[PDB]
Amino acid sequence: AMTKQYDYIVIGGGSGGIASANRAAMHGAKVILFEGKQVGGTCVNVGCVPKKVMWYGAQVAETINNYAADYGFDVTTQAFHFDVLKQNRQAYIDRIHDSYERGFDSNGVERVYGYATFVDAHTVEVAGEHYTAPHILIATGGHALLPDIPGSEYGITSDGFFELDAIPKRTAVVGAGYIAVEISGILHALGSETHLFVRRDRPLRKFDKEIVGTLVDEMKKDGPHLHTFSVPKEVIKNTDNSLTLILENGEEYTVDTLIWAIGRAANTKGFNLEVTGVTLDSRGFIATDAFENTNVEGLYALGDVNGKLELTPVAVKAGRQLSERLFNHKPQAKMDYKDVATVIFSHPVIGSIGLSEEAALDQYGEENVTVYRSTFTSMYTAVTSHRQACKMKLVTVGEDEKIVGLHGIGYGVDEMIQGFAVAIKMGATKADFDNTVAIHPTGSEEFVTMR
Amino acid sequence: AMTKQYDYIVIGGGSGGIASANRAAMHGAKVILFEGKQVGGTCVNVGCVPKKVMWYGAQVAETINNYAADYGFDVTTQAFHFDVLKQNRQAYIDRIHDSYERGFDSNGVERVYGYATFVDAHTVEVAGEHYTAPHILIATGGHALLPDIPGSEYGITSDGFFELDAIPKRTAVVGAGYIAVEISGILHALGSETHLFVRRDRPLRKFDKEIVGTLVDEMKKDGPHLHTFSVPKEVIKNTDNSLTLILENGEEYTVDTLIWAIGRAANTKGFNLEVTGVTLDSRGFIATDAFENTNVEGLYALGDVNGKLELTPVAVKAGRQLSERLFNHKPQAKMDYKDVATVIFSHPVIGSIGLSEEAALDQYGEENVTVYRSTFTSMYTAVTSHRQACKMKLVTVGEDEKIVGLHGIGYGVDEMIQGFAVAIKMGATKADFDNTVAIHPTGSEEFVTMR
Ligand SMILES: Cc1cc2nc3c(=O)[nH]c(=O)nc-3n(C[C@H](O)[C@H](O)[C@H](O)COP(=O)(O)OP(=O)(O)OC[C@H]3O[C@@H](n4cnc5c(N)ncnc54)[C@H](O)[C@@H]3O)c2cc1C
Ligand SMILES: Cc1cc2nc3c(=O)[nH]c(=O)nc-3n(C[C@H](O)[C@H](O)[C@H](O)COP(=O)(O)OP(=O)(O)OC[C@H]3O[C@@H](n4cnc5c(N)ncnc54)[C@H](O)[C@@H]3O)c2cc1C
Ligand SMILES: OC[C@@]1(O)OC[C@@H](O)[C@@H](O)[C@@H]1O
Ligand SMILES: [Cl-]
Ligand SMILES: [Cl-]
Ligand SMILES: [Cl-]
Ligand SMILES: [Cl-]
Ligand SMILES: [Cl-]
Ligand SMILES: [Cl-]
Ligand SMILES: [Cl-]
Ligand SMILES: [Cl-]
Numbered sequence: 001a002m003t004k005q006y007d008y009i010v011i012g013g014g015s016g017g018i019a020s021a022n023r024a025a026m027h028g029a030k031v032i033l034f035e036g037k038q039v040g041g042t043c044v045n046v047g048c049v050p051k052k053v054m055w056y057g058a059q060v061a062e063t064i065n066n067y068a069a070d071y072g073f074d075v076t077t078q079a080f081h082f083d084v085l086k087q088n089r090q091a092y093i094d095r096i097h098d099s100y101e102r103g104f105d106s107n108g109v110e111r112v113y114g115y116a117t118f119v120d121a122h123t124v125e126v127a128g129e130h131y132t133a134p135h136i137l138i139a140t141g142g143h144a145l146l147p148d149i150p151g152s153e154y155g156i157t158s159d160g161f162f163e164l165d166a167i168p169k170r171t172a173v174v175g176a177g178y179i180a181v182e183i184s185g186i187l188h189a190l191g192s193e194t195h196l197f198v199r200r201d202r203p204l205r206k207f208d209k210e211i212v213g214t215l216v217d218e219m220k221k222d223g224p225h226l227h228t229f230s231v232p233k234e235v236i237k238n239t240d241n242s243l244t245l246i247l248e249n250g251e252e253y254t255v256d257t258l259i260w261a262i263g264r265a266a267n268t269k270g271f272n273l274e275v276t277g278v279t280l281d282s283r284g285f286i287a288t289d290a291f292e293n294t295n296v297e298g299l300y301a302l303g304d305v306n307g308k309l310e311l312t313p314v315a316v317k318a319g320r321q322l323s324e325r326l327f328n329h330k331p332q333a334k335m336d337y338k339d340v341a342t343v344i345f346s347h348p349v350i351g352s353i354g355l356s357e358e359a360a361l362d363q364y365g366e367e368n369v370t371v372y373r374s375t376f377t378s379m380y381t382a383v384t385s386h387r388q389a390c391k392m393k394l395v396t397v398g399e400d401e402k403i404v405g406l407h408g409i410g411y412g413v414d415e416m417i418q419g420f421a422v423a424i425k426m427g428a429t430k431a432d433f434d435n436t437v438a439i440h441p442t443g444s445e446e447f448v449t450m451r
Numbered sequence: 452a453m454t455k456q457y458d459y460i461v462i463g464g465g466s467g468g469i470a471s472a473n474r475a476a477m478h479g480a481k482v483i484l485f486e487g488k489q490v491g492g493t494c495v496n497v498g499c500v501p502k503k504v505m506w507y508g509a510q511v512a513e514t515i516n517n518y519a520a521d522y523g524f525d526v527t528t529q530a531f532h533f534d535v536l537k538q539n540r541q542a543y544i545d546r547i548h549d550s551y552e553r554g555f556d557s558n559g560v561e562r563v564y565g566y567a568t569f570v571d572a573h574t575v576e577v578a579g580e581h582y583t584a585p586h587i588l589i590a591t592g593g594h595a596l597l598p599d600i601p602g603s604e605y606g607i608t609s610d611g612f613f614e615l616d617a618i619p620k621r622t623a624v625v626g627a628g629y630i631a632v633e634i635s636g637i638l639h640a641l642g643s644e645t646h647l648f649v650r651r652d653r654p655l656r657k658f659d660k661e662i663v664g665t666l667v668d669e670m671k672k673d674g675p676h677l678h679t680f681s682v683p684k685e686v687i688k689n690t691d692n693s694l695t696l697i698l699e700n701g702e703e704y705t706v707d708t709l710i711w712a713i714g715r716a717a718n719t720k721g722f723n724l725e726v727t728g729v730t731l732d733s734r735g736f737i738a739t740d741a742f743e744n745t746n747v748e749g750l751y752a753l754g755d756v757n758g759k760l761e762l763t764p765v766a767v768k769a770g771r772q773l774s775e776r777l778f779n780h781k782p783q784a785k786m787d788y789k790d791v792a793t794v795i796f797s798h799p800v801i802g803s804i805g806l807s808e809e810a811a812l813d814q815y816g817e818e819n820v821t822v823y824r825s826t827f828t829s830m831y832t833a834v835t836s837h838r839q840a841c842k843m844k845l846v847t848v849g850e851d852e853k854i855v856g857l858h859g860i861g862y863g864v865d866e867m868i869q870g871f872a873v874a875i876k877m878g879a880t881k882a883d884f885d886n887t888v889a890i891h892p893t894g895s896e897e898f899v900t901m902r
Contacts, residue, residue, distance in 0.1 A: 005478060048892045056831050063514045064519065070535065071507065072533055072534070073467050073512070075515060075528050076529060077524055084523040092830075228661050313890065313896070340888045343893065353654075382543060389592060413744075414866075414893060417890055418868060418870060418898060418899060419871035419898070420873060421879060423870060423874045424880075437792065437875040439802075440494070442765050442869060445866070448872075
């Protein structure tokens with residue numbers, strides 16, 4: 001069987017691969033995409049989408065349990081059917097799969113649902129057939145890490161969290177990143193006795209400290225039990241099938257399910273990447289330049305596998321810009337990785353753009369940083385017996401007070417950030433914010449009324 | 452008793468008057484403020500604040516009644532106690548009152564809770580005493596209009612809506628503006644058989660037609676009963692105390708409560724404004740220049756009474772800018788009334804900045820306008836049996852596609868608009884939006900991923 005020629009081969013049908021394959025096809029490239037598991041990759045199947053559906057479920061629980069009575073509603077929960085939530089979650093995800101397949105047909109992207117293995121730098125094997133192209137994108141994503149301790153195998157990862165068919169009575173979540181925080185918040189809201197174990201002082205250690213302080217204070221009021229300076233030593237499986245987590249400090253916790261959310265690493269093994277000559281960086285990600293080029297001409301890498309910024313919209317935009325470059329004659333087209341906004345679906349949620357106050361002071365010096373901050377109680381919660389704080393801040397630099405960081409935590413913050421991210425990308429200053437008329441009554445107006 | 456001398460007299464203790472009085476006092480002016488009713492004016496007592504608390508109660512109802520089951524929560528409502536909601540709403544408002552009084556004391560603003568009547572162009576009478584100043588601000592607000600038909604007196608206005616101590620079993624809401632749409636939306640969510648009557652083909656006629664199309668479709672699915680081409684002829688009070696609304700088309704609707712939300716007019720009567728020589732415009736508002744000057748030196752007018760834009764933050768900023776000009780040596784200080792964002796707390800919410808597609812076409816010409824859109828189902832509702840559309844639109848002009856209009860309708864839109872308002876005030880183009888990385892998964896990202 002002769003080797004099949006293509007203009008572009010995309011390895012991975014996740015956010016990055018789909019985005020790049022579709023854009024290449026829209027510019028006339030003969031493109032083929034390979035996916036060894038399910039279309040949509042991590043975000044659609046075991047990431048952002050199912051996480052957000054579950055977060056909405058947690059919002060519903062909070063409404064019923066914490067706020068309804070104070071708005072006059074005397075309600076009783078006859079039962080909670082996790083299976084109903086999961087079936088509706090999966091039906092939504094299946095519709096997303098269908099949409100991607102309709103998109104490939106429309107754009108003319110060929111795809112084979114099979115695992116791709118390199119034969120040489122410009123050739124891969126899938127289901128026994130060989131395929132070659134002068135352009136090959138490695139968009140293979142990452143995977144969850146497991147600690148190297150006795151009993152590590154008794155824990156599950158975020159993938160296993162989505163495989164659950166019921167809320168465990170008691171759950172341990174180990175980790176200090178956004179995934180650990182999100183999962184632990186959802187589990188607590190949905191009724192699990194939830195314990196969050198962070199290795200050092202607090203979760204989200206690199207985030208703005210003032211904002212994370214409120215996260216910690218609110219979790220204490222309504223959230224998982226937080227255990228600081230908690231370093232896992234071992235996990236024991238007891239006779240009754242429960243798990244006991246043993247920490248280096250000697251403390252022990254018994255739970256039904258234990259979730260490792262300690263980090264993610266690049267998917268670089270199992271597909272004969274070594275024959276390509278592609279170099280990895282010191283953290284194990286595929287090394288790339290500003291244009292997603294590996295060290296080998298005709299091989300590119302983007303999305304989670306390049307380690308730059310593990311977010312769906314980053315993979316999508318980088319993938320689209322690469323295709324603009326390779327197939328639409330734009331040698332300068334590339335991803336802009338600066339001031340990318342994020343939202344962490346904690347409870348309450350955190351929204352962030354740019355530098356923390358700590359990073360700004362480190363970079364610019366205390367004499368050149370001016371911080372504006374507003375702290376209040378979200379109106380939604382203010383009238384109830386479960387009042388919740390909201391903290392917002394603008395980190396500015398220089399005489400013209402250019403906004404280099406914007407952060408908030410509180411009810412509704414998840415939908416506030418995107419617009420401000422446009423303004424920050426345009427170089428907004430405090431004056432630009434002052435020139436904007438507030439929208440009342442909203443939480444978002446507090447960002448433009450600080451003084 | 453001689454006439455008391457002041458630097459500044461503010462007639463009205465609402466959003467505009469409070470803001471202007473406080474800022475004038477901060478710059479050393481001897482200021483006195485007069486308020487004939489409650490401190491805080493319309494927004495605090497019978498406007499934005501109580502409206503928003505009620506809207507949150509409606510959102511809780513929607514969660515319980517429409518979405519909870521599909522998230523796996525089988526919930527029953529034993530009772531709805533409107534009194535609980537109202538008491539918490541009033542407590543919140545009372546705290547605002549207290550904070551204003553403390554602020555006046557701190558800032559050095561004198562106030563008398565009495566109605567002010569003009570004696571001459573520079574002198575007012577309050578509780579028998581005379582007061583004079585070379586600067587007098589008329590910030591008297593507006594009032595709800597009542598139709599001139601038999602039985603008009605049986606209806607209440609939005610003030611009466613806040614006086615209600617229970618949700619009426621059946622409610623008629625008459626009008627086509629944001630107040631009618633918001634009130635009818637709240638009444639329906641909270642359980643009233645609600646009928647909304649508009650005089651022409653649709654509500655919110657000045658808003659972008661495609662956005663209103665979604666509003667109408669969603670209202671037909673889940674909202675009040677909408678009656679178009681419906682002009683009130685008379686209201687009959689029946690022997691059982693119900694009210695029958697009779698329309699010019701012959702239809703009759705029997706309800707328990709009827710709310711007139713047909714428009715608001717300036718407060719210009721009853722305080723001897725005629726002796727000042729202040730000119731009114733053809734719509735009955737106090738005419739003013741860009742600096743809030745009336746035609747009479749030493750007399751100013753801002754907030755709802757000047758007719759420019761009926762919004763709290765507008766009244767606040769105009770009042771502050773006026774005090775900057777009069778008392779802080781800033782002759783060019785003034786309000787910027789262009790591209791002021793608004794949110795309408797309809798079901799679902801509408802957010803808007805700038806020109807509708809129709810207005811942009813009229814102004815710039817068809818050859819010079821380009822529109823972008825996103826139409827989807829909000830993820831929150833997508834997994835339920837009450838799926839709700841979300842629609843977003845960018846209206847752009849010229850070769851650079853400057854954004855002159857931004858509009859959205861759907862879940863969470865209320866918190867999305869503020870940040871985009873900053874970007875538009877900075878002169879954002881479609882390229883500036885394209886340059887901004889999306890935040891996923893949110894509704895807000897759909898504003899920056901249109902093609
Ligand atoms: C729990 C969780 C929550 C998250 N929440 C968010 C969020 O709220 N917002 C956000 O922006 N991001 C979020 N992320 C991150 C987001 O999911 C990733 O940044 C994104 O999926 C990366 O896209 P990608 O294309 O690089 O990789 P992936 O989507 O992981 O795609 C890689 C694909 O390649 C396939 N593959 C690998 N090797 C081969 C091979 N040899 N042959 C064929 N196929 C192969 C895999 O099967 C996989 O489907 C979350 C991640 C997790 C784990
Ligand atoms: C139902 C409703 C909902 C609303 N929702 C919103 C919203 O969501 N967002 C928004 O931005 N805006 C909203 N508004 C509009 C907002 O309330 C007004 O734009 C704002 O209150 C106007 O402020 P003002 O200072 O001009 O007038 P007001 O706040 O009305 O203050 C005028 C004051 O002057 C007093 N007064 C009048 N004459 C005299 C006199 N001779 N002597 C002494 N005192 C006098 C009155 O008692 C009154 O307190 C809403 C309005 C209504 C009615
Ligand atoms: O007004 C609250 C709200 O609209 O804020 C934005 C989103 O968080 C929504 O879930 C939420 O209902
Ligand atoms: Cl795509
Ligand atoms: Cl797992
Ligand atoms: Cl359960
Ligand atoms: Cl990681
Ligand atoms: Cl029309
Ligand atoms: Cl305008
Ligand atoms: Cl167009
Ligand atoms: Cl979403």
